[PDB]
Amino acid sequence: EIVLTQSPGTLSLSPGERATLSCRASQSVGNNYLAWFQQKPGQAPRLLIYGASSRATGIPDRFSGSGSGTDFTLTISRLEPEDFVVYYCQQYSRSPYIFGQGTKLEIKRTVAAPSVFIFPPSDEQLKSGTASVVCLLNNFYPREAKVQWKVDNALQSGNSQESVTEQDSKDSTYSLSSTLTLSKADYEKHKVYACEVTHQGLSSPVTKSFNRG
Amino acid sequence: IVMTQSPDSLAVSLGERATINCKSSQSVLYSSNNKNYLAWFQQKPGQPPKLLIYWASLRESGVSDRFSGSGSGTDFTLTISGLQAEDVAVYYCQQYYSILWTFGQGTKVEIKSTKGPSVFPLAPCTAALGCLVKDYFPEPVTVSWNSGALTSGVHTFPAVLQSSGLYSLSSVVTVPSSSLGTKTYTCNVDHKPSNTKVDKRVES
Amino acid sequence: EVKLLESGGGLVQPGRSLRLSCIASGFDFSGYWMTWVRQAPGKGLEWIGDINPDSSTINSTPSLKDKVIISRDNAKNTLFLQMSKVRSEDTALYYCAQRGNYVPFPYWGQGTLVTVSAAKTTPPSVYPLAPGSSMVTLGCLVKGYFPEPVTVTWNSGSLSSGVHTFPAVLQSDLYTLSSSVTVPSSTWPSETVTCNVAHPASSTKVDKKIVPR
Amino acid sequence: SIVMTQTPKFLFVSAGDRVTITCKASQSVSNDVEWYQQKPGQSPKLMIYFASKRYNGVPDRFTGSGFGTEFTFTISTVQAEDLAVYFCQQDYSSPWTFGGGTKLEIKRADAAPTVSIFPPSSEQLTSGGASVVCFLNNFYPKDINVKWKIDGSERQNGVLNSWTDQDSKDSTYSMSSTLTLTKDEYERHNSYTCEATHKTSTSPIVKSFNRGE
Ligand SMILES: C[C@]12CC[C@H](O)C[C@@]1(O)CC[C@@H]1[C@@H]2CC[C@]2(C)[C@@H](c3ccc(=O)oc3)C[C@H]3O[C@]132
Ligand SMILES: C[C@]12CC[C@H](O)C[C@@]1(O)CC[C@@H]1[C@@H]2CC[C@]2(C)[C@@H](c3ccc(=O)oc3)C[C@H]3O[C@]132
């Protein structure tokens, strides 16, 4: 197949700046049948560019496609703050038809280490038969942070769920929550609960913990 | 050319048949060759779309037998004969009749249940505190603090779908640690589908 | 229109402690991370520490990490640096700075000079420099103060063009500097010329008029 | 920590020319590298941030570029007021680290010094001391030889020299020479001479006075 490889995964720019997204093909794309899609939060995709460099009708001036065969760029010449979303490339020259994994445009802002907190499960939740432990990363950037649960110093694996906010409307940071979920039966078999957070803006990892009672 | 889908969200028991309709504002039947320029897409959270059907009814390579579109002219249908856990996703129809590919608004598909939320205090041993809204279906839940009086330093996280087939989320607020003795903090969870509001006071 | 004003700079005994204060004005203080930076005699810049806006966080180099304490008071709009186990290496001038939500370090305090020497505080004697009898040159010699720095001006800063204020020289554990000013030959002594010396370390100010002999 | 290495360590350049400073990283920092101008007697000042964006009130003759590990600072059409030390600094990590710095010097023509000599003030003599001061102002190049003579005989002890930093307006240098004597020794001799040796003339510049006149 033609596999389309988008670069980079996330591009960090300020409104007004020009963006150059890249779509690299494993195999020459026939007749430059290369299309670009916009996709906004909770919306169906939008055709932006087709035939490598043809701007679709209703698409503004500032979006333009460039390149042929294996090397393609989408240039957004004067960035509007609504434009910061996911962009997909997609070829229609040869079956099977497959999407690029996507490039997400996010707003650039310095670097901020997270404010970390941990919460023990409530008595009411333990009586209902389940134990959810929450680790909170507060107002950080960039989004790339590693959250590791340690239960009696034992690194946990795939029994925890992370949720991350949309980038903040005032200071352009993220908050993130990790929830480690055990049965009451299992939760009460261990003493120390810790979330260790590695983030780029920290000199070294910060650990947050509690002993049950 | 405008694509309208219905229903917009679909709850079907596991293994049952699921049906989504797509209607075009104009015929996408091409008189001269007798072909429908209609396609179907699957899109799962945090992933690109996956082409399933095109020419209204032709399955793309590696699309399972249970996926089958039908109908032509202005009214079309995608049916999943034996619905599985892995088929839970968003589905779009797309017209390529005219060099202006347009998608429907999309249809969410999920597993039936219908439960109200559970709220618990997130409180530890500036200070942070919060609410955990656990085991609810369907979406959505709206969380406020002190009936929308407190909004500064609030973060309410996007919901996640648990192994249960039920949703869970968290809402947190950072407050002056000095104020924890005096000012009240109440989180208000409105779940419009279960016809419920729950107000949990969170204490230190 | 932003102002960061450091205070507490001066001499300290080795092994003792020092506190710097920084008062910020003309920007929503409780909305920003604030940082300390220092510059040794050797002119290298050394990042020290930072704070997120809730003092519920810190970012400090290891080197120091376990030696200084950084902290802040929102309502009072003031930033603090506590040093303990003070040494030779801590002799530098210290800069207060904003951390900025879309721009790294756009705002620096003028900087406050910290000296670590058992030496005793001393005020300067100020001596005018007038000719033995196109353009005329005058000066004043500021002898025997400790520690650095002084601030020297001419006619309360109104004469700043054609001024040369020379780097101090250390001599018998006391500093000496000179400052020169050049004006048109008919301007002096027809019009009055005074050099003004503030020595913040002794809380003194001296205004010495230049006298024809 | 991340090492930022600047090159060259110094740059001497004629007015109106290009200077290109480069800064190289021990690992990728993406955008987050930034340039500070520091003029003498002043704090560092932000000029370029995100390797390529201008901070405001920075003239547009200043420009940056780079990504990953390799970054550059350019001044096109260098002029007199740009005399400063320049620093790179990374935000993509912790600790945040500044480069070694690059000191800028302005090439121009030659200029002979303005030489002024001063006997001790009556204020200094009243209190029992005696200093002779010689100002050599607005000369180039920086290399200069000053010599003191008492009744025609050379004297080296009690002499203290200081050079000003190269000027922000005219790119010249200035020098202060201070000969300190006991009041005893000052009153023991009559003729005091300041001799300047500088490439602008083969004949040394001589200025003098007699105590008893
Ligand atoms: C559904 C679609 C899938 C891939 C794209 O992301 C969207 C798409 O809507 C573009 C359009 C569509 C494409 C499927 C394949 C096409 C029908 C293809 C074609 C192939 C053989 C033929 O005889 O006539 C035409 C050329 C292009 O029209 C195609
Ligand atoms: C513009 C387009 C029009 C119809 C669709 O709404 C969009 C479209 O972009 C899809 C694809 C495109 C179609 C125009 C005609 C095609 C180029 C056709 C073809 C014809 C001769 C040939 O030698 O090779 C291929 C088969 C299919 O690829 C076609």
Short mmCIF file of C-alpha atoms in Angstrom, two decimals, chain D residues 127-205:
data_model
loop_
_atom_site.label_atom_id
_atom_site.label_comp_id
_atom_site.label_asym_id
_atom_site.label_seq_id
_atom_site.Cartn_x
_atom_site.Cartn_y
_atom_site.Cartn_z
CA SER D 127 41.90 65.07 56.10
CA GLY D 128 45.63 64.16 55.57
CA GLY D 129 45.71 62.34 52.15
CA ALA D 130 46.86 63.30 48.59
CA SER D 131 45.74 61.80 45.21
CA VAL D 132 46.79 63.04 41.70
CA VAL D 133 44.23 62.07 38.98
CA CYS D 134 44.76 61.88 35.17
CA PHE D 135 41.77 61.33 32.78
CA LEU D 136 42.58 60.11 29.21
CA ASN D 137 39.19 60.26 27.41
CA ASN D 138 37.65 59.08 24.07
CA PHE D 139 40.73 57.34 22.46
CA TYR D 140 41.17 54.25 20.17
CA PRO D 141 42.52 51.62 20.09
CA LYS D 142 42.14 50.45 23.77
CA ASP D 143 45.93 49.71 24.17
CA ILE D 144 47.57 52.70 26.01
CA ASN D 145 50.61 53.31 28.28
CA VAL D 146 50.28 55.94 31.09
CA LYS D 147 53.39 56.89 33.16
CA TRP D 148 53.73 59.14 36.28
CA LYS D 149 56.83 61.34 36.97
CA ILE D 150 57.69 63.37 40.14
CA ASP D 151 60.40 66.07 39.55
CA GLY D 152 61.22 64.31 36.21
CA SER D 153 61.78 60.85 37.87
CA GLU D 154 59.46 57.83 37.17
CA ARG D 155 57.09 56.57 39.97
CA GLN D 156 55.07 53.26 39.82
CA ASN D 157 53.92 52.66 43.49
CA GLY D 158 50.55 54.15 44.59
CA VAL D 159 49.25 54.26 40.94
CA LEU D 160 45.75 52.76 40.29
CA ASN D 161 44.33 52.43 36.70
CA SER D 162 40.74 51.75 35.48
CA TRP D 163 39.41 51.43 31.88
CA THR D 164 35.77 52.33 31.03
CA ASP D 165 33.89 49.92 28.72
CA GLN D 166 33.88 50.92 25.00
CA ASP D 167 31.28 53.70 24.46
CA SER D 168 27.65 53.05 23.26
CA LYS D 169 27.61 56.36 21.24
CA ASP D 170 31.09 56.78 19.60
CA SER D 171 32.88 53.37 20.22
CA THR D 172 35.91 55.08 21.94
CA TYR D 173 37.59 54.11 25.29
CA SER D 174 38.49 56.27 28.36
CA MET D 175 41.02 55.71 31.22
CA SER D 176 41.43 57.00 34.84
CA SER D 177 44.94 57.01 36.44
CA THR D 178 45.10 57.75 40.24
CA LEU D 179 48.52 58.31 41.95
CA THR D 180 47.96 58.21 45.77
CA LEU D 181 50.76 59.64 47.99
CA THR D 182 51.17 60.52 51.70
CA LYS D 183 50.60 64.31 52.20
CA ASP D 184 54.25 64.21 53.52
CA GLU D 185 55.60 63.03 50.11
CA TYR D 186 53.23 65.28 48.05
CA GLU D 187 54.60 68.44 49.81
CA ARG D 188 58.23 67.06 49.45
CA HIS D 189 58.24 67.46 45.56
CA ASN D 190 57.10 70.21 43.08
CA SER D 191 56.55 69.08 39.41
CA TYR D 192 54.01 66.24 38.72
CA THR D 193 53.69 64.81 35.14
CA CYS D 194 51.24 62.44 33.33
CA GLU D 195 52.72 60.93 30.07
CA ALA D 196 50.46 59.08 27.52
CA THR D 197 52.04 56.63 24.97
CA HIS D 198 49.58 55.76 22.12
CA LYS D 199 50.09 54.73 18.43
CA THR D 200 48.35 57.98 17.16
CA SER D 201 51.65 59.93 17.75
CA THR D 202 55.35 58.96 18.17
CA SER D 203 55.77 61.99 20.55
CA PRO D 204 54.16 61.15 23.95
CA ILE D 205 51.28 63.44 25.16
#
